[PDB]
């Protein structure tokens, strides 16, 4: 059931912005680890005296990394005279965010038809304003409301290249890395209480519910914007990873970004080659019993050779009533056991592929558990 | 003239510690960019609830990257019960350092015979104490005094593997990268006023003077610990890079680390291959006139093919009355135009090679200038 109740016209995920201590080092690490190319910049060399912002892209996936300069460089500025390219940026907010939470996502940005309308409608329907609509070079409008914790939902709308004031990055510094990642599939928040978080976000967006934790998924009309939210379940045998997150993050925040690959086998080969030479590590692989049990579960979707390739790369498989999901999880992206990345590819639900085809892999909690005890034999 | 006036027994450079917002991402970037292997760790997985510290090594070069966790994880600790492996660490100091200066060097660590004596003698001779001598597991003593700005000179002494509480890093996460870097040759500070900085440091160490800026070099008895210091020269045609540093760094601090390579050609080939895929960029190469002029300057030291290899890699060459220096400079290591790295290799002064053989490349300021105007032809 999709009641299509969006209160404003939403298109797709647009970008994810990380708030960093040093944007250069995080961006370079992420570029090599994920196969994303340097696409745009806004920094001292472009006249920005306030913040350094570097954009990585892979396909339609856009990762922005931002860090503040010394406030002294912009001490004579006021908002009407700012050299910042992202007008919502604030030195104190950024330093406080990073001190509190460490490296993590500040903004989940979605493209909308009209950021000013989306902002007004959101706030009229309960959204906590974070940054009012600001028109950039009469070409792009950006606005922000609180999503959960210190994460904002950013609306961006275009009259007609990332943002005004950003410069495209010269060829020599833009190595065309590509490991197959193509778009953001979903972005997941951890909160102390799921009910109030869902009511708030669904309240101001009109997003509907999509068919050690409790979780639920909010979706836009065409179910291409997907925002799962998790709460911890206390008292369990093993401590909830949601609760560990909330402790080390100092509260609610973005838990994982799921990145769709057009070839998850190639993506994982390339990322795993780089794990120990600057890239990302992956969670421990499932036991062989898990891949033995895949024949009964998805033997009609994946061949034996494809199942063996899943085993070689540590890939997990889950299945909907409609589609099949291939997924795998990185270890945390930074010092704290907080944010991590999921790589996914979906098969089925062809009409284009409908959003969320195959689900989110919740069935892999039991399948992993069963395979572990089975393997303990 | 070397009066050998060290006030305590100094051995060699031991390590350099960077204070970071996220140690993981900086360390992984540096590992790939410089060819340094992950050698030791102190973090949540080793029982450290206070800071994350990761050690990279290449030969005798030791780079330590440290970032604070949430203070909440250690709120019940006091110094007598700390889980920090580096007892001088302080959350507030680290966050304030990074907020003020961005990514940069907190500690220049030298190995001494007795860190407690070195500390006492230093302070008795004018050093500003920063952290008193603390004995770690009855095996290692560490102490810190102020060097310049918020950089400390750290003394470490060993009774008889990096520091107690650090764990050696498992093989799988310790890829044996190596681009030829072998040790720290010198560490350079930028200050507003050279005179008072030299008087202070030479005052408490007994280090002697080694034979857009004014600079001088302080050296230990065997001239293996080398600490140049720069001040800006104001009013010049081009703005002093020392002054730009001081503005963007919010004052005095470490300007560059010079890393000795046992094969600077291999090091630069390997680093340049990685510049645009997560590693480090290099300053713009000299014009062809510079390499034409090398024949007259060092044609007795380097063959034509070796001179051409210098041209291929953008390497600079300078000459003492005793030796020859090959050097090259990276672009800044992070967002701010502050700290950068120098790669060097020295030829001559064989006895082992004596310290500072060939000088520090000051002659390359004029040689670059001349070659630029000559090339403008
Ligand atoms: C690392 C680690 C441990 N771990 C996971 O984190 C994990 C995750 C994070 C998902 C997932 O993507 C997801 C959503 O997208 C919305 C629904 C709730 C949720 O959990 C699915 C399976 C997982 N499995 C099996 C697992 O073992
Ligand atoms: C980047 C950039 C511009 N740049 C440098 O920074 C540069 C440096 C930093 C050195 C150097 O190593 C050094 C010392 O070790 C102690 C003495 C003072 C000093 O400067 C030598 C030559 C240099 N040249 C030619 C140059 O062009
Ligand atoms: Co997911
Ligand atoms: Co130097």
3D shape of chain A = globular
Can you list the ligands bound to this structure?
A: the ligand C#CCn1c(=O)c2c(C)c(C(=O)C3=C(O)CCCC3=O)ccc2n(C)c1=O, cobalt (II) ion
Q: Number of helical runs of chain A? A: 10
Distance between the termini of chain A: 43 Å
Main sheet: strand order of chain A: 6-7-8-5-1-4-3-2-9
CATH topology of the largest domain in chain A: 2,3-Dihydroxybiphenyl 1,2-Dioxygenase, domain 1
CATH-wise, what's the superfamily of the largest domain in chain A? 2,3-Dihydroxybiphenyl 1,2-Dioxygenase, domain 1
Element string of chain A (H = helix, E = strand): EHEEEHEHEEEEEHEEEHEHHHHEEEH
Most residues in contact, chain pair and counts: A-B, 47 and 47 residues
Count of structural domains of chain A: 2
- Can you give the helix content of chain A as a percent range? 25-40%
CA gyration radius of chain A, whole angstroms: 21 Å
> How is the biggest beta sheet of chain A arranged?
9 strands, mixed
Which quaternary structure do these chains form? Answer: homodimer
Show the helix and strand layout.
Two copies of one chain form a homodimer.
Chain A: E1 10-19, H1 23-34, E2 37-42, E3 51-58, E4 61-68, H2 91-101, E5 104-112, H3 115-124, E6 129-136, E7 140-148, E8 151-158, E9 167-168, E10 181-190, H4 194-205, E11 208-209, E12 213-219, E13 226-232, H5 241-249, E14 253-261, H6 264-274, H7 288-292, H8 294-298, H9 304-313, E15 316-319, E16 323-329, E17 340-348, H10 363-375
Provide an overview of this structure.
The structure is a homodimer of 377-residue chains. With 377 residues, chain A is of the alpha+beta class. Chain A folds into 2 domains: 10-173, 2,3-Dihydroxybiphenyl 1,2-Dioxygenase, domain 1 (Roll); 181-376, 2,3-Dihydroxybiphenyl 1,2-Dioxygenase, domain 1. In chain A, the strands form 2 sheets. In chain A, strands 6-7-8-5-1-4-3-2-9 form a 9-stranded mixed sheet. Chain A has an 8-stranded mixed sheet with strand order 11-12-13-10-14-17-16-15. Chain A starts with 9 loop residues before the first strand and ends with a helix. The radius of gyration of chain A is 21 Å and the shape is globular. Chain A contains 10 helices and 17 strands. Chain A has helices spanning 23-34, 91-101, 115-124, 194-205, 241-249, 264-274, 288-292, 294-298, 304-313, 363-375, and strands at residues 10-19, 37-42, 51-58, 61-68, 104-112, 129-136, 140-148, 151-158, 167-168, 181-190, 208-209, 213-219, 226-232, 253-261, 316-319, 323-329, 340-348. Chains A, B: Catalyzes the conversion of 4-hydroxyphenylpyruvic acid to homogentisic acid, one of the steps in tyrosine catabolism.
């Amino acid at each position: 059931k999709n009641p299509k109740s969006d209160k404003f016209k939403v298109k797709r995920f647009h970008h994810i912005e990380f708030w960093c201590g040093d944007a250069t080092n995080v961006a370079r690490r992420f570029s090599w680890g994920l196969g994303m190319r340097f696409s745009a910049k806004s920094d001292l060399s472009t006249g920005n005296m306030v913040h350094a912002s570097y954009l990585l892209t892979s396909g339609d996936l856009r990762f922005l990394f931002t860090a503040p300069y010394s406030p002294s460089l912009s001490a004579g500025e006021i908002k009407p005279t700012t050299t910042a390219s992202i007008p919502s940026f604030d030195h104190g907010s950024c330093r406080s965010f990073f001190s509190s939470h460490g490296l993590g996502v500040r903004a989940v940005a979605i493209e909308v038809e009209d950021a000013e309308s989306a902002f007004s409608i959101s706030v009229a329907n309960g959204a906590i304003p974070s940054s009012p609509p600001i028109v950039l070079n009469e070409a792009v409008t950006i606005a922000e409301v609180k999503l959960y914790g210190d994460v904002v939902l950013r609306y961006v709308s275009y009259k007609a290249e990332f943002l005004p004031g950003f410069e495209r990055v010269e060829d020599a510094s833009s190595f065309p890395l590509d490991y197959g990642i193509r778009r953001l599939d979903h972005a997941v928040g951890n909160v102390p209480e799921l009910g109030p978080a869902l009511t708030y976000v669904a309240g101001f967006t009109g997003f509907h519910q999509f068919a050690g934790l409790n979780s639920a998924v909010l979706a836009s009309n065409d179910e291409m914007v997907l925002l799962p939210i998790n709460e911890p379940v206390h008292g369990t045998k093993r401590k909830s990873q949601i609760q560990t997150y909330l402790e080390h993050n100092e509260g609610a925040g973005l838990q994982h970004l799921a990145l769709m690959s057009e070839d998850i086998f190639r993506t994982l080969r390339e990322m795993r080659k780089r794990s120990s030479i600057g890239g990302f590590d992956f969670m421990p692989s499932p036991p062989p019993t898990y891949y033995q049990n895949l024949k009964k579960r998805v033997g009609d979707v994946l061949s034996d050779d494809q199942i063996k390739e899943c085993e070689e790369l540590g890939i997990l498989v889950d299945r909907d009533d409609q589609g099949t999901l291939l997924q795998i999880f990185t270890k945390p992206l930074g010092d704290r056991p907080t944010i991590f990345i999921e790589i996914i590819q979906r098969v089925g639900c062809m009409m284009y592929q409908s959003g969320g085809c195959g689900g989110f892999g919740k069935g892999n909690f039991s399948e992993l558990f069963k395979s572990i005890e089975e393997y303990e034999k």
